[PDB]
Amino acid sequence: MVNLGLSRVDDAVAAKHPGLGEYAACQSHAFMKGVFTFVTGTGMAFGLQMFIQRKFPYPLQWSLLVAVVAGSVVSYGVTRVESEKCNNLWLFLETGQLPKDRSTDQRS
């Protein structure tokens, strides 16, 4: 079982040779980008909450505070699962495993 050794070495090499690792990251990046745009495709809710939250004499909004605190914690957790998966995917892509096309479209 590989825990930490040739893994970091191979990764380091990848960082030295931008081609596969770059494409892989570019892949998870693109997908993550679309997911980010989609998830954030419902900011309206936050907009209303923000407007009503702006009725406070405070600078930061309870929604922003909760979104920040929850965003930080959730960010870590999501980063842990995203890192573990992104890692497994990095290895898979580094091996040439099966692909995983996906739609996005994107709009700005």
Curated annotation (Swiss-Prot):
Main subcellular location of this protein, as a coarse class: membrane
Top-rank taxon, per record: Eukaryota
Gene expressing this chain: TMEM141
Topological type in the membrane: Multi-pass membrane protein
PANTHER family reported in the protein's UniProt record: TRANSMEMBRANE PROTEIN 141
Keyword Transmembrane helix on entry: yes
Keyword terms, alphabetized: Membrane, Transmembrane, Transmembrane helix
Protein family per UniProt: Belongs to the TMEM141 family.
Descriptive protein name: Transmembrane protein 141
Transmembrane feature ranges: 32-52, 58-78
Record's subcellular location: Membrane
Keyword Nucleotide-binding: no
One term under GO cellular component: mitochondrion
